[PDB]
Protein backbone atom coordinates (compact mmCIF):
# COMPACT_ATOMS: atom_id res chain seq x y z
CA UNK A 1 0.00 0.00 0.00
CA UNK A 2 2.93 2.36 0.60
CA UNK A 3 4.53 1.65 -2.79
CA UNK A 4 1.35 2.32 -4.76
CA UNK A 5 0.78 5.50 -2.75
CA UNK A 6 4.27 6.62 -3.75
CA UNK A 7 3.38 5.87 -7.38
CA UNK A 8 -0.10 7.42 -7.14
CA UNK A 9 1.26 10.81 -6.05
CA UNK A 10 3.55 13.48 -7.47
CA UNK A 11 4.97 15.02 -4.28
CA UNK A 12 5.84 11.59 -2.86
CA UNK A 13 8.16 10.67 -5.74
CA UNK A 14 10.02 13.99 -5.89
CA UNK A 15 10.44 14.30 -2.11
CA UNK A 16 12.38 11.03 -1.90
CA UNK A 17 14.76 12.11 -4.66
CA UNK A 18 15.23 15.52 -3.01
CA UNK A 19 15.98 13.80 0.32
CA UNK A 20 18.79 11.41 -0.65
CA UNK A 21 20.95 13.99 -2.46
CA UNK A 22 20.44 16.71 0.16
CA UNK A 23 21.44 14.39 3.02
CA UNK A 24 24.06 12.58 0.88
CA UNK A 25 22.48 9.23 1.75
CA UNK A 26 24.24 6.18 0.34
CA UNK A 27 21.16 4.06 -0.52
CA UNK A 28 23.53 1.48 -2.07
CA UNK A 29 25.41 -0.14 0.82
CA UNK A 30 22.11 -1.13 2.45
CA UNK A 31 21.09 -2.84 -0.80
CA UNK A 32 24.15 -5.13 -0.74
CA UNK A 33 17.63 3.69 -8.80
CA UNK A 34 17.17 2.84 -5.11
CA UNK A 35 13.81 3.59 -3.51
CA UNK A 36 10.82 1.90 -1.85
CA UNK A 37 10.59 -0.32 -4.94
CA UNK A 38 13.72 -2.13 -3.71
CA UNK A 39 11.77 -3.54 -0.76
CA UNK A 40 8.78 -4.35 -2.98
CA UNK A 41 10.98 -6.25 -5.44
CA UNK A 42 12.47 -8.11 -2.44
CA UNK A 43 9.06 -8.94 -0.93
CA UNK A 44 6.84 -9.52 -3.98
CA UNK A 45 7.60 -13.30 -4.11
CA UNK A 46 6.33 -14.00 -0.58
CA UNK A 47 3.23 -11.88 -1.19
CA UNK A 48 2.77 -13.72 -4.49
CA UNK A 49 2.55 -17.14 -2.80
CA UNK A 50 -1.22 -16.65 -2.44
CA UNK A 51 -1.65 -16.04 -6.18
CA UNK A 52 -3.40 -19.44 -6.52
CA UNK A 53 -1.94 -20.30 -9.97
CA UNK A 54 -5.43 -21.26 -11.12
CA UNK A 55 -6.13 -17.53 -10.69
CA UNK A 56 -3.37 -16.51 -13.12
CA UNK A 57 -6.15 -15.82 -15.62
CA UNK A 58 -7.80 -13.52 -13.07
CA UNK A 59 -4.61 -11.46 -12.66
CA UNK A 60 -4.62 -10.86 -16.42
CA UNK A 61 -7.83 -8.87 -16.83
CA UNK A 62 -7.53 -7.37 -13.34
CA UNK A 63 -4.44 -5.39 -14.38
CA UNK A 64 -6.22 -4.06 -17.47
CA UNK A 65 -9.14 -2.95 -15.30
CA UNK A 66 -6.65 -0.98 -13.21
CA UNK A 67 -5.37 0.50 -16.48
CA UNK A 68 -8.91 1.87 -16.93
CA UNK A 69 -8.41 4.19 -13.93
CA UNK A 70 -11.14 2.29 -12.09
CA UNK A 71 -11.46 2.56 -8.32
CA UNK A 72 -11.12 -0.34 -5.89
CA UNK A 73 -14.90 -0.68 -5.65
CA UNK A 74 -15.21 -0.76 -9.45
CA UNK A 75 -12.68 -3.57 -9.90
CA UNK A 76 -14.03 -5.44 -6.86
CA UNK A 77 -17.48 -5.44 -8.44
CA UNK A 78 -15.86 -6.24 -11.80
CA UNK A 79 -14.19 -9.34 -10.36
CA UNK A 80 -17.28 -10.27 -8.31
CA UNK A 81 -19.19 -10.85 -11.57
CA UNK A 82 -16.45 -13.11 -13.01
CA UNK A 83 -16.35 -15.78 -10.29
CA UNK A 84 -17.44 -18.38 -12.85
CA UNK A 85 -14.44 -17.40 -15.01
CA UNK A 86 -11.84 -19.09 -12.82
CA UNK A 87 -8.95 -21.02 -14.32
CA UNK A 88 -10.45 -24.50 -14.77
CA UNK A 89 -7.64 -25.42 -17.16
CA UNK A 90 -6.55 -28.42 -15.08
CA UNK A 91 -6.37 -30.52 -18.25
CA UNK A 92 -3.57 -28.40 -19.67
CA UNK A 93 0.04 -29.38 -18.89
CA UNK A 94 1.06 -25.81 -18.00
CA UNK A 95 -1.10 -25.83 -14.85
CA UNK A 96 -0.81 -29.58 -14.24
CA UNK A 97 2.38 -29.41 -12.16
CA UNK A 98 1.49 -26.07 -10.56
CA UNK A 99 -1.65 -27.53 -8.98
CA UNK A 100 0.31 -30.47 -7.56
CA UNK A 101 2.97 -28.14 -6.13
CA UNK A 102 0.31 -25.97 -4.48
CA UNK A 103 -1.40 -29.04 -3.01
CA UNK A 104 1.96 -30.16 -1.61
CA UNK A 105 2.38 -27.16 0.68
CA UNK A 106 2.83 -27.85 4.42
CA UNK A 107 0.29 -25.15 5.29
CA UNK A 108 -3.47 -25.11 4.76
CA UNK A 109 -11.95 -21.02 -0.43
CA UNK A 110 -14.21 -18.12 0.54
CA UNK A 111 -15.03 -15.95 -2.51
CA UNK A 112 -14.66 -12.80 -0.41
CA UNK A 113 -11.09 -13.79 0.44
CA UNK A 114 -10.48 -14.83 -3.17
CA UNK A 115 -11.49 -11.44 -4.56
CA UNK A 116 -9.46 -9.64 -1.87
CA UNK A 117 -6.12 -11.31 -2.60
CA UNK A 118 -6.34 -11.00 -6.40
CA UNK A 119 -7.12 -7.27 -6.22
CA UNK A 120 -4.29 -6.68 -3.75
CA UNK A 121 -1.82 -8.52 -5.99
CA UNK A 122 -3.10 -6.71 -9.09
CA UNK A 123 -2.58 -3.25 -7.57
CA UNK A 124 1.06 -4.00 -6.75
CA UNK A 125 1.72 -5.67 -10.10
CA UNK A 126 0.00 -3.03 -12.25
CA UNK A 127 1.87 -0.01 -10.90
CA UNK A 128 5.11 -2.01 -10.95
CA UNK A 129 4.66 -2.46 -14.70
CA UNK A 130 3.97 1.28 -14.96
CA UNK A 131 7.42 2.02 -13.51
CA UNK A 132 9.00 -1.06 -15.14
CA UNK A 133 9.52 1.00 -18.33
CA UNK A 134 11.28 4.24 -17.28
Amino acid sequence: EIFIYWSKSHNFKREEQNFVVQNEINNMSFLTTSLIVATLKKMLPIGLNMCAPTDQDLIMLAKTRYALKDTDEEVREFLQNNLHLQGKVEGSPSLRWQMALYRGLPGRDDPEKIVRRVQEVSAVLYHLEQTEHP
Binding site: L44, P45, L48, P93, R96, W97, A100
Partner: peptide, 23 residues
Protein backbone atom coordinates in the same frame (compact mmCIF):
# COMPACT_ATOMS: atom_id res chain seq x y z
CA UNK B 1 11.34 -34.63 -10.42
CA UNK B 2 10.00 -31.27 -9.19
CA UNK B 3 8.85 -32.97 -5.99
CA UNK B 4 12.43 -34.09 -5.30
CA UNK B 5 14.03 -30.71 -6.05
CA UNK B 6 15.71 -29.08 -3.06
CA UNK B 7 14.65 -25.66 -4.39
CA UNK B 8 12.35 -23.96 -6.95
CA UNK B 9 10.18 -22.96 -3.98
CA UNK B 10 12.33 -20.38 -2.20
CA UNK B 11 13.14 -18.94 -5.64
CA UNK B 12 12.04 -19.83 -9.15
CA UNK B 13 8.30 -20.45 -9.37
CA UNK B 14 7.52 -17.04 -7.86
CA UNK B 15 8.90 -15.56 -11.07
CA UNK B 16 7.77 -16.82 -14.45
CA UNK B 17 9.85 -19.96 -14.96
CA UNK B 18 9.52 -23.70 -15.50
CA UNK B 19 11.76 -26.73 -14.92
CA UNK B 20 13.87 -27.72 -17.91
CA UNK B 21 12.33 -31.20 -18.32
CA UNK B 22 9.00 -30.76 -16.54
CA UNK B 23 6.99 -32.84 -19.04
Amino acid sequence: DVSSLRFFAICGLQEGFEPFAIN
